[PDB]
């Protein structure tokens, strides 16, 4: 959840918001190790419920998200249902566990390609046009992350937009992402420069991947 | 002496506007068929399966014409080559259908078949079903027959399944056409077409459009 003023600005200026719980356990092995554990349900539930209680009156918030990259665990299913019961006025989405679990109203993959499948075991990233028509599938698809804008990037962006416009159920996506996470450091003469992962003595690090 | 007046055009023509040569005449076989007064006048074969196709029930509804008699029976027997695999015998008179009873002139036979050999375009396994109309004592009145393929066709979850597996149709539309005989078909041309199709990786044909 963001600084409270962000929602007020989005209400007034006009932007649609996906308000997301402060839950990411990406580093776990497997990713759902905590989220499938009932002992971690109280802690997860408070990150979800206290968000809804704070933000539910903002019209800019149109979708609730259960967090990010925490696999898919039974705790997600429980909290999906909690929100659906407490606030029927907004869809719930969540990407973990393959982007199309029973804990999401919207198929919301990250970096699924337009035409090319990436059939990873257990959590495949189908071509988005193919994903829509998988036997039994009815939901809309909106990418929670696509077109990774790291450095000299965004090649093939038009290809997403051609598909979004042609397919009713492809309803767009969220580019990753807005702003380079660089930090200012100074040289001996007091000149500012853009620093990334590893420039502060932080180890292990992931270098320019923050940008 | 038979006399046949064939008309090129009729009100039927309005429903026969297929994109092809418009021709006319007695273009398919003519035959004479002798049946007994007490006859099999219709018969349907159904095959249905358990979840993994390791068991089947062959169901045969048989209709008769002529005078009803207590001594009348139908036997449906099912054959794999020269080996009889299943058989059923019953008198006429179907289940109750409504307030007025059932069909006294029909009977349904049900035969169990374990581990049936399944029919597909890949392996066209066939059994032979013989439908015998006869007396309880064993005198044959007549027999009809057909080839039986044990297979289930269904649409499930948006997929067309044959024997539970999603089909990939390598099909072609095929009109009945011969450059010398027009729309008269013969076994040799038919066989030639089939062989070519299968030699060229086709598994399906559409009867375009009749
Ligand atoms: O759509 C069609 O066009 C074909 C053109 O060859 C042919 O006339 C078919 O009978 C018809 O269904
Ligand atoms: Mg036509
Ligand atoms: Na669309
Ligand atoms: Na990053």
CATH number at residue A17: 3.20.20.80
Separation of A156 CA from ligand 1 center, angstroms? 38
Cα torsion at A45, A47, A49, A55 (round to 10°)? -170
Separation CA A35–CA A29 (nearest Å): 11
β-bridge pairing A192-195 and A183-186: antiparallel
| CA-angle at B170, arms to B169 and B173, nearest 5° | 100
Chain A residues touching B158 at Cβ < 8 A: 135-136
Separation CA B71–CA B164 (nearest Å): 42
Q: How far is CA A59 from CA A88, B40, B187, in A?
A: 14, 74, 74
Separation CA B152–CA A190 (nearest Å): 80
Separation CA A3–CA A6 (nearest Å): 6
**By what method was this entry solved?**
X-ray
Neighbour count for residue A200 (Cβ, 10 Å): 11
Active site residues of A: 69, 145
Dihedral of alpha carbons B18, B24, B28, B31, sign: positive
Q: Per the annotation, does A209 bind a ligand?
A: yes
Chain A residues touching B159 at Cβ < 8 A: 135
The residues facing B47 across adjacent strands are B58
Biggest CA pair distance of chain A: 64
Q: Which residues of B are annotated as a binding site for substrate?
A: 19
Kindly provide the resolution of this structure in angstroms, with one decimal: 2.4
Biggest CA pair distance of chain B: 58
Separation CA B54–CA A50 (nearest Å): 55
Q: What are residue A92's phi and psi, to 5 degrees?
A: -110, 130
Question: How far does A168 lie from chain B, in Å, by closest CA?
Answer: 19
In chain A, residues 115-174 whose CB comes closer than 8 Å to chain B: 135-136
Separation CA A125–CA A107 (nearest Å): 11
Separation of B60 CA from ligand 2 center, angstroms? 38
Separation of B16 CA from ligand 2 center, angstroms? 10
Question: The tokens of B2 are what?
Answer: 């038979």
Please say whether the beta carbons of B62 and B131 come within 8 A. yes
Q: Where are the alpha helices (H) located in A146-185, listed in sequence order? A: 157-166
The bound ligand whose nearest atom lies closest to the alpha carbon of B175 is 1
Query: What's the DSSP call for residue B25?
Result: S
Q: Give residue A155's domain range.
A: 1-211
CATH T-level fold of B37-151:
Immunoglobulin-like (2.60.40)
Please say whether the beta carbons of A83 and A52 come within 8 A. yes
Q: Which residues of B are annotated as a binding site?
A: 19
DSSP, collapsed to helix, strand or coil, labels residue A163 as: helix
Q: From the centroid of its chain, how far is CA B70?
A: 29
The bound ligand whose nearest atom lies closest to the alpha carbon of A132 is 3
Q: Nearest CA to B3 among B33, B29, B35, B26?
A: B26
DSSP, collapsed to helix, strand or coil, labels residue A210 as: helix
Question: How far does B155 lie from chain A, in Å, by closest CA?
Answer: 11
Chain B residues touching A136 at Cβ < 8 A: 157-158
Cα torsion at B13, B18, B24, B29 (round to 10°)? -110
The residues facing B91 across adjacent strands are B73
DSSP, collapsed to helix, strand or coil, labels residue B45 as: strand
Query: What's the DSSP call for residue A69?
Result: S
Q: Nearest CA to A67 among A120, A126, A144?
A: A144
């Amino acid at each position: 959840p963001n600084h409270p003023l962000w929602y007020t600005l989005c209400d007034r200026y006009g932007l649609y918001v996906v308000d997301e719980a402060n839950i990411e356990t990406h580093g776990m092995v497997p990713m759902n190790r905590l989220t499938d554990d009932p002992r971690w349900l109280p802690a997860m539930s408070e990150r979800v419920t206290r968000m809804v209680q704070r933000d539910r009156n903002h019209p800019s918030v149109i979708i609730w998200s259960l967090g990010n990259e925490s696999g898919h665990g039974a705790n997600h299913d429980a909290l999906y249902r909690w929100i659906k019961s407490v606030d029927p006025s907004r869809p719930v989405q969540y990407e973990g566990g393959g982007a199309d679990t029973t804990a999401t109203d919207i198929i919301c993959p990250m970096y699924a390609r337009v035409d090319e499948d990436q059939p990873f075991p257990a959590v495949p990233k189908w071509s988005i046009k193919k994903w829509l028509s998988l036997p039994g599938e009815t939901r809309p698809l909106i990418l929670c992350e696509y077109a990774h804008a790291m450095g000299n990037s965004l090649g093939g962006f038009a290809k997403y937009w051609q598909a979004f416009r042609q397919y009713p159920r492809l309803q767009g996506g969220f580019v990753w992402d807005w702003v380079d996470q660089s930090l200012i450091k100074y040289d001996e003469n007091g000149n500012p420069w853009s620093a990334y992962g590893g420039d502060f003595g932080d180890t292990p690090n992931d270098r320019q991947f923050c940008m | 002496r038979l006399a046949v007046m064939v008309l090129r055009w009729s009100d039927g023509s309005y429903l026969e506007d297929q994109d092809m040569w418009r021709m006319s005449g007695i273009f398919r076989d003519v035959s004479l068929l002798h049946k007994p007064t007490t006859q099999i006048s219709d018969f349907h074969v159904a095959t249905r399966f358990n979840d993994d196709f390791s068991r089947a029930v062959l169901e045969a509804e048989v209709q008769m014409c002529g005078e009803l008699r207590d001594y009348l029976r139908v036997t449906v027997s099912l054959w794999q080559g020269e080996t009889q695999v299943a058989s059923g015998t019953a008198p006429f008179g179907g289940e109750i259908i409504d307030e007025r009873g059932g069909y006294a002139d029909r009977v349904t036979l049900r035969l169990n078949v374990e581990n049936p050999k399944l029919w597909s375009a890949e392996i066209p396994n066939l059994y032979r079903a013989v439908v015998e109309l006869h007396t309880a004592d064993g005198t044959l009145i007549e027999a009809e027959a057909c080839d039986v393929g044990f297979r289930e066709v269904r649409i499930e979850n948006g997929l067309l399944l044959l024997n539970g597996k999603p089909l990939l149709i390598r099909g072609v539309n095929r009109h009945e056409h011969h450059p010398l005989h027009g729309q008269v078909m013969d076994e040799q041309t038919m066989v030639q077409d089939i062989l070519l199709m299968k030699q060229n990786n086709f598994n399906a044909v559409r009867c375009s459009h009749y």
